[PDB]
Amino acid sequence: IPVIEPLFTKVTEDIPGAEGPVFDKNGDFYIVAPAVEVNGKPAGEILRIDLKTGKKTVICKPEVNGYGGIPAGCQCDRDANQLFVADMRLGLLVVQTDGTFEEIAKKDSEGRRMQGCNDCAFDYEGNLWITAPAGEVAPADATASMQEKFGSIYCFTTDGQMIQVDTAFQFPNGIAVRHMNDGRPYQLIVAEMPTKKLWSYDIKGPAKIENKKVWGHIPGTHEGGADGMDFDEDNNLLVANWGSSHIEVFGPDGGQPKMRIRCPFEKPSNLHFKPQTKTIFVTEHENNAVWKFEWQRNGKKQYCETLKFGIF
Ligand SMILES: [Ca+2]
Ligand SMILES: [Ca+2]
Protein backbone atom coordinates (compact mmCIF):
# COMPACT_ATOMS: atom_id res chain seq x y z
CA ILE A 1 0.00 0.00 0.00
CA PRO A 2 1.54 3.31 -1.10
CA VAL A 3 2.64 5.59 1.74
CA ILE A 4 3.32 9.32 1.53
CA GLU A 5 5.26 11.31 4.12
CA PRO A 6 4.16 14.95 3.91
CA LEU A 7 5.89 17.59 6.01
CA PHE A 8 3.95 18.19 9.23
CA THR A 9 3.97 21.55 10.99
CA LYS A 10 3.30 21.83 14.73
CA VAL A 11 0.34 24.16 15.40
CA THR A 12 -0.26 24.15 19.15
CA GLU A 13 0.34 21.93 22.15
CA ASP A 14 -0.59 21.07 25.71
CA ILE A 15 -4.17 20.12 24.88
CA PRO A 16 -5.06 17.03 26.98
CA GLY A 17 -6.68 14.51 24.65
CA ALA A 18 -6.63 16.98 21.74
CA GLU A 19 -9.69 16.28 19.59
CA GLY A 20 -12.60 17.65 17.58
CA PRO A 21 -10.77 20.04 15.23
CA VAL A 22 -13.26 22.30 13.48
CA PHE A 23 -13.67 25.63 11.68
CA ASP A 24 -16.75 27.79 12.14
CA LYS A 25 -18.47 29.98 9.53
CA ASN A 26 -16.07 32.82 10.27
CA GLY A 27 -12.98 30.71 9.77
CA ASP A 28 -12.04 30.56 13.43
CA PHE A 29 -10.44 27.27 14.51
CA TYR A 30 -11.41 25.22 17.56
CA ILE A 31 -10.38 21.95 19.19
CA VAL A 32 -11.58 20.17 22.32
CA ALA A 33 -9.60 18.86 25.29
CA PRO A 34 -11.63 15.91 26.63
CA ALA A 35 -8.85 14.63 28.89
CA VAL A 36 -8.61 17.72 31.09
CA GLU A 37 -9.28 16.81 34.73
CA VAL A 38 -9.59 18.83 37.92
CA ASN A 39 -8.91 16.97 41.15
CA GLY A 40 -9.10 13.75 39.15
CA LYS A 41 -12.60 14.51 37.86
CA PRO A 42 -13.64 15.26 34.25
CA ALA A 43 -13.31 18.95 33.37
CA GLY A 44 -13.10 18.97 29.58
CA GLU A 45 -12.60 22.18 27.61
CA ILE A 46 -13.57 23.63 24.23
CA LEU A 47 -10.82 25.89 22.92
CA ARG A 48 -10.37 28.45 20.16
CA ILE A 49 -6.91 28.35 18.58
CA ASP A 50 -4.97 31.23 17.03
CA LEU A 51 -3.60 29.65 13.85
CA LYS A 52 -0.77 32.17 13.71
CA THR A 53 0.66 31.75 17.21
CA GLY A 54 -0.99 28.64 18.61
CA LYS A 55 -2.49 30.72 21.42
CA LYS A 56 -5.32 28.87 23.12
CA THR A 57 -8.45 30.52 24.51
CA VAL A 58 -10.97 28.62 26.62
CA ILE A 59 -14.43 29.34 25.23
CA CYS A 60 -16.31 26.76 27.30
CA LYS A 61 -15.72 24.32 30.18
CA PRO A 62 -19.16 22.59 30.25
CA GLU A 63 -20.60 21.08 33.41
CA VAL A 64 -24.14 20.03 34.32
CA ASN A 65 -25.22 19.80 37.96
CA GLY A 66 -21.70 19.34 39.28
CA TYR A 67 -20.58 16.93 36.56
CA GLY A 68 -17.84 18.13 34.25
CA GLY A 69 -18.04 17.35 30.57
CA ILE A 70 -15.74 15.50 28.21
CA PRO A 71 -16.23 17.30 24.86
CA ALA A 72 -14.70 15.08 22.18
CA GLY A 73 -16.05 15.91 18.73
CA CYS A 74 -17.39 18.95 16.86
CA GLN A 75 -19.36 20.10 13.83
CA CYS A 76 -19.95 23.63 12.56
CA ASP A 77 -23.53 24.90 12.19
CA ARG A 78 -24.27 26.52 8.84
CA ASP A 79 -27.08 28.82 9.98
CA ALA A 80 -25.77 30.11 13.31
CA ASN A 81 -22.53 30.85 15.13
CA GLN A 82 -22.63 27.80 17.32
CA LEU A 83 -20.84 24.47 17.48
CA PHE A 84 -22.49 21.09 17.93
CA VAL A 85 -20.33 19.13 20.33
CA ALA A 86 -20.31 15.40 21.07
CA ASP A 87 -19.60 15.06 24.81
CA MET A 88 -18.62 11.71 26.39
CA ARG A 89 -20.27 12.63 29.71
CA LEU A 90 -22.99 15.10 28.75
CA GLY A 91 -24.24 13.82 25.37
CA LEU A 92 -24.93 16.36 22.62
CA LEU A 93 -24.27 20.01 23.39
CA VAL A 94 -24.78 23.17 21.34
CA VAL A 95 -22.10 25.68 22.22
CA GLN A 96 -22.23 29.37 21.41
CA THR A 97 -18.78 30.54 20.34
CA ASP A 98 -19.29 33.42 22.78
CA GLY A 99 -19.25 31.31 25.94
CA THR A 100 -22.52 29.52 26.71
CA PHE A 101 -23.98 26.09 26.04
CA GLU A 102 -27.16 24.05 26.16
CA GLU A 103 -27.74 20.32 26.55
CA ILE A 104 -29.65 19.23 23.42
CA ALA A 105 -31.43 16.34 25.16
CA LYS A 106 -31.35 14.27 28.36
CA LYS A 107 -33.33 11.46 26.71
CA ASP A 108 -33.73 10.18 23.14
CA SER A 109 -36.90 9.84 21.06
CA GLU A 110 -37.80 6.67 22.96
CA GLY A 111 -37.40 8.29 26.35
CA ARG A 112 -34.17 6.48 27.24
CA ARG A 113 -31.34 8.32 28.92
CA MET A 114 -28.75 9.67 26.50
CA GLN A 115 -25.43 7.85 26.01
CA GLY A 116 -22.17 9.81 26.07
CA CYS A 117 -21.15 10.92 22.57
CA ASN A 118 -17.75 11.00 20.82
CA ASP A 119 -17.96 12.51 17.31
CA CYS A 120 -20.59 13.73 14.86
CA ALA A 121 -21.12 14.64 11.20
CA PHE A 122 -23.73 16.91 9.63
CA ASP A 123 -25.19 15.73 6.35
CA TYR A 124 -26.04 18.46 3.84
CA GLU A 125 -29.68 18.45 4.88
CA GLY A 126 -28.85 19.53 8.42
CA ASN A 127 -29.25 16.16 10.15
CA LEU A 128 -26.52 15.27 12.66
CA TRP A 129 -25.19 11.71 12.80
CA ILE A 130 -23.54 10.98 16.15
CA THR A 131 -21.41 8.20 17.62
CA ALA A 132 -22.00 7.31 21.27
CA PRO A 133 -19.43 4.80 22.59
CA ALA A 134 -19.97 5.76 26.23
CA GLY A 135 -22.61 4.53 28.64
CA GLU A 136 -25.40 6.68 30.05
CA VAL A 137 -24.61 10.37 30.46
CA ALA A 138 -23.98 11.92 33.87
CA PRO A 139 -25.02 11.58 36.63
CA ALA A 140 -24.81 7.87 35.73
CA ASP A 141 -21.43 6.23 36.42
CA ALA A 142 -19.05 6.42 33.47
CA THR A 143 -18.46 3.38 31.27
CA ALA A 144 -17.12 2.70 27.76
CA SER A 145 -17.83 0.12 25.06
CA MET A 146 -14.19 -0.74 24.33
CA GLN A 147 -14.91 -4.36 25.32
CA GLU A 148 -18.71 -4.68 25.41
CA LYS A 149 -20.89 -3.94 22.40
CA PHE A 150 -23.28 -1.30 23.72
CA GLY A 151 -22.09 1.70 21.72
CA SER A 152 -24.83 3.40 19.73
CA ILE A 153 -25.42 5.71 16.77
CA TYR A 154 -27.83 8.65 16.82
CA CYS A 155 -29.30 11.02 14.29
CA PHE A 156 -30.49 14.38 15.60
CA THR A 157 -32.90 15.57 12.92
CA THR A 158 -33.58 19.10 11.71
CA ASP A 159 -36.98 18.83 13.40
CA GLY A 160 -35.47 18.15 16.83
CA GLN A 161 -35.70 14.35 17.03
CA MET A 162 -32.85 12.51 18.80
CA ILE A 163 -33.16 9.07 17.23
CA GLN A 164 -30.98 6.09 18.09
CA VAL A 165 -30.54 4.62 14.61
CA ASP A 166 -28.40 1.63 15.62
CA THR A 167 -26.50 0.10 18.52
CA ALA A 168 -24.38 -2.89 19.59
CA PHE A 169 -21.09 -1.33 18.44
CA GLN A 170 -17.78 -1.92 20.17
CA PHE A 171 -16.77 1.71 20.72
CA PRO A 172 -18.08 3.55 17.64
CA ASN A 173 -15.86 6.59 17.08
CA GLY A 174 -15.37 8.41 13.79
CA ILE A 175 -18.32 9.03 11.49
CA ALA A 176 -18.91 10.56 8.05
CA VAL A 177 -21.55 11.08 5.39
CA ARG A 178 -21.01 10.62 1.64
CA HIS A 179 -23.13 12.83 -0.63
CA MET A 180 -24.11 12.72 -4.31
CA ASN A 181 -23.15 15.80 -6.31
CA ASP A 182 -26.69 17.15 -5.98
CA GLY A 183 -26.18 17.23 -2.23
CA ARG A 184 -28.22 14.13 -1.39
CA PRO A 185 -26.78 12.12 1.54
CA TYR A 186 -26.62 8.47 0.53
CA GLN A 187 -24.05 6.66 2.67
CA LEU A 188 -23.10 6.70 6.34
CA ILE A 189 -19.70 5.43 7.47
CA VAL A 190 -19.12 4.50 11.10
CA ALA A 191 -15.79 3.57 12.62
CA GLU A 192 -15.80 0.75 15.18
CA MET A 193 -12.40 1.41 16.73
CA PRO A 194 -11.06 -1.72 18.50
CA THR A 195 -12.41 -4.13 15.86
CA LYS A 196 -10.48 -2.35 13.11
CA LYS A 197 -13.60 -2.05 10.97
CA LEU A 198 -15.43 0.67 9.11
CA TRP A 199 -19.16 0.08 8.69
CA SER A 200 -21.41 1.51 6.00
CA TYR A 201 -25.16 2.02 5.59
CA ASP A 202 -27.25 3.37 2.75
CA ILE A 203 -28.97 6.57 3.88
CA LYS A 204 -32.59 6.62 2.71
CA GLY A 205 -33.55 9.84 4.47
CA PRO A 206 -33.40 11.70 7.81
CA ALA A 207 -32.53 9.11 10.47
CA LYS A 208 -33.15 6.31 7.96
CA ILE A 209 -30.25 3.93 7.35
CA GLU A 210 -30.32 0.44 5.84
CA ASN A 211 -28.15 -2.30 4.35
CA LYS A 212 -25.55 -2.36 7.11
CA LYS A 213 -22.26 -3.98 6.04
CA VAL A 214 -18.55 -4.00 6.80
CA TRP A 215 -17.20 -1.37 4.39
CA GLY A 216 -13.48 -1.17 5.11
CA HIS A 217 -10.60 -2.69 7.01
CA ILE A 218 -8.26 -0.71 9.24
CA PRO A 219 -4.62 -1.94 9.11
CA GLY A 220 -2.94 -3.20 12.27
CA THR A 221 -3.45 -5.21 15.45
CA HIS A 222 -2.27 -2.37 17.71
CA GLU A 223 -4.40 -1.04 20.56
CA GLY A 224 -6.64 1.57 18.98
CA GLY A 225 -7.91 1.77 15.43
CA ALA A 226 -10.08 4.14 13.41
CA ASP A 227 -10.76 7.39 15.27
CA GLY A 228 -11.84 10.57 13.42
CA MET A 229 -12.59 10.78 9.69
CA ASP A 230 -13.43 13.13 6.80
CA PHE A 231 -13.81 13.04 3.01
CA ASP A 232 -11.63 15.00 0.58
CA GLU A 233 -13.19 16.61 -2.52
CA ASP A 234 -12.92 13.35 -4.48
CA ASN A 235 -14.79 11.46 -1.76
CA ASN A 236 -11.68 9.61 -0.62
CA LEU A 237 -12.11 8.93 3.10
CA LEU A 238 -9.19 9.93 5.34
CA VAL A 239 -9.21 8.10 8.65
CA ALA A 240 -6.99 8.67 11.67
CA ASN A 241 -5.73 5.21 12.68
CA TRP A 242 -4.91 5.80 16.36
CA GLY A 243 -1.84 3.83 17.42
CA SER A 244 -0.63 3.10 13.89
CA SER A 245 1.21 6.38 13.20
CA HIS A 246 -0.80 6.71 9.98
CA ILE A 247 -3.91 8.33 8.56
CA GLU A 248 -5.58 5.80 6.24
CA VAL A 249 -6.94 6.84 2.85
CA PHE A 250 -9.88 4.88 1.44
CA GLY A 251 -11.22 5.09 -2.09
CA PRO A 252 -14.97 5.51 -2.81
CA ASP A 253 -15.39 1.72 -2.72
CA GLY A 254 -13.78 1.02 0.65
CA GLY A 255 -12.08 -2.29 1.34
CA GLN A 256 -8.36 -1.84 2.02
CA PRO A 257 -6.74 1.62 2.17
CA LYS A 258 -5.58 2.89 -1.24
CA MET A 259 -2.85 4.90 0.46
CA ARG A 260 -1.47 5.69 3.92
CA ILE A 261 -0.19 8.98 5.32
CA ARG A 262 2.67 8.59 7.79
CA CYS A 263 2.47 10.93 10.79
CA PRO A 264 5.37 12.10 12.99
CA PHE A 265 3.38 10.65 15.90
CA GLU A 266 1.76 7.33 16.78
CA LYS A 267 -1.71 8.47 17.86
CA PRO A 268 -3.62 10.64 15.39
CA SER A 269 -7.06 11.22 16.93
CA ASN A 270 -8.86 13.38 14.39
CA LEU A 271 -8.55 15.71 11.41
CA HIS A 272 -10.30 18.57 9.64
CA PHE A 273 -9.67 20.43 6.38
CA LYS A 274 -9.29 24.19 6.25
CA PRO A 275 -12.07 25.42 3.92
CA GLN A 276 -10.96 26.07 0.33
CA THR A 277 -7.53 24.52 0.95
CA LYS A 278 -5.59 21.24 0.91
CA THR A 279 -4.45 21.91 4.47
CA ILE A 280 -5.44 19.27 7.01
CA PHE A 281 -5.22 19.94 10.72
CA VAL A 282 -4.56 16.87 12.83
CA THR A 283 -5.07 16.34 16.56
CA GLU A 284 -3.05 13.60 18.27
CA HIS A 285 -2.69 11.98 21.67
CA GLU A 286 1.01 11.15 21.76
CA ASN A 287 1.99 14.76 22.42
CA ASN A 288 -1.54 16.13 22.98
CA ALA A 289 -1.01 18.67 20.24
CA VAL A 290 -2.32 19.86 16.89
CA TRP A 291 -0.44 19.78 13.58
CA LYS A 292 -1.10 20.50 9.93
CA PHE A 293 0.08 19.17 6.58
CA GLU A 294 -0.89 19.50 2.91
CA TRP A 295 -3.03 16.79 1.29
CA GLN A 296 -3.22 16.11 -2.47
CA ARG A 297 -6.43 18.12 -2.83
CA ASN A 298 -9.09 20.21 -1.08
CA GLY A 299 -11.46 18.67 1.41
CA LYS A 300 -15.12 17.88 0.95
CA LYS A 301 -17.18 20.87 2.03
CA GLN A 302 -18.61 20.65 5.53
CA TYR A 303 -22.28 21.39 6.14
CA CYS A 304 -21.54 24.94 7.16
CA GLU A 305 -19.82 25.68 3.84
CA THR A 306 -22.92 24.64 1.88
CA LEU A 307 -25.50 26.86 0.18
CA LYS A 308 -28.71 27.26 2.19
CA PHE A 309 -30.60 28.42 -0.91
CA GLY A 310 -28.64 26.35 -3.40
CA ILE A 311 -26.85 27.55 -6.53
CA PHE A 312 -28.38 30.79 -7.77
CA1 LIG B 1 -12.95 10.59 18.31
CA1 LIG C 1 -13.17 16.60 11.02
From Swiss-Prot:
Effect of residue 75 to F: 100% decrease in activity
Pfam families cross-referenced by the UniProt entry: SGL
Stated consequence of mutating residue 230 to S: 3% increase in activity. 19% decrease in activity
Effect of residue 312 to A: 3% increase in activity
Outcome recorded upon mutating residue 146 to A: 26% decrease in activity
UniProt subunit comment: Monomer.
Name of the molecule in the record: Diisopropyl-fluorophosphatase
Record lineage: Eukaryota, Metazoa, Spiralia, Lophotrochozoa, Mollusca
